[PDB]
Amino acid sequence: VWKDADTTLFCASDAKAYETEVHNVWATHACVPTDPNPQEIHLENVTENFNMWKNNMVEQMHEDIISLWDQSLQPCVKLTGGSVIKQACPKISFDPIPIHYCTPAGYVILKCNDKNFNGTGPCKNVSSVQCTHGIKPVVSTQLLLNGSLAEEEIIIRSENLTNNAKTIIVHLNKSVEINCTRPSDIRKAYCEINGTKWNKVLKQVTEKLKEHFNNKTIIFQPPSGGDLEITMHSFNCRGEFFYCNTTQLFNNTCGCNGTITLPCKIKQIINMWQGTGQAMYAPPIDGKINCVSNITGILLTRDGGANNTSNETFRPGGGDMRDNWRSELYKYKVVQIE
Ligand SMILES: N=C(N)N1CCC[C@H]1C(=O)N1CCN(C(=O)N2CCC[C@H](C(=O)Nc3ccc(Cl)c(F)c3)C2)CC1
Ligand SMILES: *[C@@H]1O[C@H](CO)[C@@H](O)[C@H](O)[C@H]1NC(C)=O
Ligand SMILES: *[C@@H]1O[C@H](CO)[C@@H](O)[C@H](O)[C@H]1NC(C)=O
Ligand SMILES: *[C@@H]1O[C@H](CO)[C@@H](O)[C@H](O)[C@H]1NC(C)=O
Ligand SMILES: *[C@@H]1O[C@H](CO)[C@@H](O)[C@H](O)[C@H]1NC(C)=O
Ligand SMILES: *[C@@H]1O[C@H](CO)[C@@H](O)[C@H](O)[C@H]1NC(C)=O
Ligand SMILES: *[C@@H]1O[C@H](CO)[C@@H](O)[C@H](O)[C@H]1NC(C)=O
Ligand SMILES: *[C@@H]1O[C@H](CO)[C@@H](O)[C@H](O)[C@H]1NC(C)=O
Ligand SMILES: *[C@@H]1O[C@H](CO)[C@@H](O)[C@H](O)[C@H]1NC(C)=O
Ligand SMILES: *[C@@H]1O[C@H](CO)[C@@H](O)[C@H](O)[C@H]1NC(C)=O
Q1: For residue 262, what are the β-bridge partners?
Q2: 119, 164, 232, 314: least CB-packed within 10 angstroms?
Q3: Burial 129-163 (b: 16+ CB within 10 A, else e)
Q4: Can you tell me whether residue 225 is helix, strand or coil?
Q5: CB 306 within 8 A of CB 32
Q6: Which atom number of ligand 9 is nearest to the Cα of residue 231?
Q7: In whole angstroms, what is the distance from residue 305 CA to residue 309 CA?
Q8: Is residue 156 in contact with ligand 3, taking CB distance under 6 Å?
């Protein structure tokens, strides 16, 4: 017997005590070691309601990662609310590691094992766990990186598809590598994507979106304004902030199918995701800066006043990292053992 409840979670990780990498350092002192003997109990004949869009676990992970960045990635200058802090900004070791979220005594985590689960509504195949799986806290916009994959079909996730203001999370079932490099202009970078791989996945995505939108025509367009962090695909590679133009990723025409090369820039002046504010970092480290990531999801925003047209147009979105955490926490919820 249990009931829906919120409580303060703790974290577990395989952090290395000797590592200078900042995620390891934070997990070493803020988490416990991962459960060496994790147990999963299947709940016979249990149906349970989930709502990934109203899930306190997401808020708690958000608070953790903000703390992680605040103790690890300090900018030369932080500009918040009129205040201006000038603190040490050395170059660091940066590579996210999986973090597990675990319940204290008197609580368990319920896990939805329905392979088609979209994040809201009833789940027929429910198990209970002490900890989630290991989630890498990858900060990014537009593209979800290094996550998990949907097990069966591509999944569309949204708090309310009919409401165009609600962010759409696309959960891929086959990852697509994105290989970004600043070769050894020191801020000029690029990302390489297999155009055959990507265009095929994207076609499947549009077909999935057809199913939710009455077989309408699915059109992609570049973001319609905003800050560079959201009009570009933003992410952190080895501590450097990359900003990549994704126009060639979301062009509906696909003489295509070669390597897709996105132009990128490393920016020193950042619009922080942790909260409204601007931060400045030192110029990039020397030599080849490279990151090979898996695209496992897409963040989309649908265009509004098309209620009576023939087209549904989608633009890459992001900005609220809670959606990133939500994309992995969607199948979990905390309950109190009554
Ligand atoms: N957290 C809470 N409680 N919130 C309540 C609703 C909005 C949200 C919120 O209050 N906020 C304020 C701060 N935010 C912001 O100002 N944004 C505008 C500028 C860009 C932002 C970006 O995505 N930055 C970024 C930086 C580096 C990387 Cl690598 C990256 F992938 C992304 C979006 C986040 C949402
Ligand atoms: C339910 O999910 C479990 C994972 O715990 C997996 O073995 C299988 O996909 C499902 N099994 C049943 C009996 O539904
Ligand atoms: C998710 O599944 C539930 C089934 O109960 C349904 O009500 C809802 O419309 C679905 N949402 C999406 C985006 O598929
Ligand atoms: C990328 O995807 C492949 C296959 O989908 C997987 O084996 C590999 O572990 C993934 N890499 C990362 C860093 O997630
Ligand atoms: C991914 O899902 C789509 C349906 O959305 C399906 O057609 C495709 O075969 C799936 N691919 C894999 C590798 O499971
Ligand atoms: C979803 O959004 C539409 C359009 O904004 C609105 O009419 C509808 O009431 C919403 N549905 C729910 C369940 O909130
Ligand atoms: C990534 O791209 C760089 C530069 O083009 C190349 O040297 C490297 O081999 C690529 N890595 C992979 C895994 O494709
Ligand atoms: C690009 O992806 C396709 C489909 O997965 C694959 O067959 C092809 O070998 C890839 N190209 C390269 C150069 O690896
Ligand atoms: C991305 O590239 C396209 C074409 O190269 C360009 O028209 C567009 O302005 C670029 N986007 C941004 C945000 O600079
Ligand atoms: C994704 O994971 C790979 C493998 O650990 C790593 O090399 C890469 O830098 C990661 N990408 C990001 C954006 O953290």
Answers
A1: 191
A2: 164
A3: bbbbebbbbbbbbbbbbbbbebeeebbbbbbeeee
A4: coil
A5: no
A6: 13
A7: 8
A8: yes
334 contacts 109 by C-beta, under 8 angstroms:
yes
**What's the number of CA atoms in the CB half-sphere (13 Å) around residue 126?**
20
Domains of the chain, earliest start first: 2-337 (2.170.40.20)
Helix-strand-coil split of the chain, %, nearest 5: 15, 40, 45
Ligand nearest to the backbone CA of 292: 10
Q: Ligand 8 in contact with 194 (CB < 6 A)? A: yes
CA-atom Rg of the chain in angstroms? 21
Bridge partners (DSSP) listed for residue 194:
259
Is the CB of residue 113 below 6 angstroms from any atom belonging to ligand 2? Answer: yes
Which atom of ligand 2 approaches the CA of 124 most closely? 14
Q: Is the C-beta atom of 248 inside 6 A of ligand 9?
A: no
Beta bridge partners of 49: 122
CA distance 143 to 297: 6
DSSP 8-state assignment for residue 140: B
Q: What is the whole-number distance in angstroms between the Cα of residue 247 and the centre of ligand 9?
A: 7
Length of the chain: 338
CA of 153 to the centre of ligand 5 (A): 5
Q: How far apart are the first and last CA of the chain?
A: 5
Reported resolution, Å: 1.8
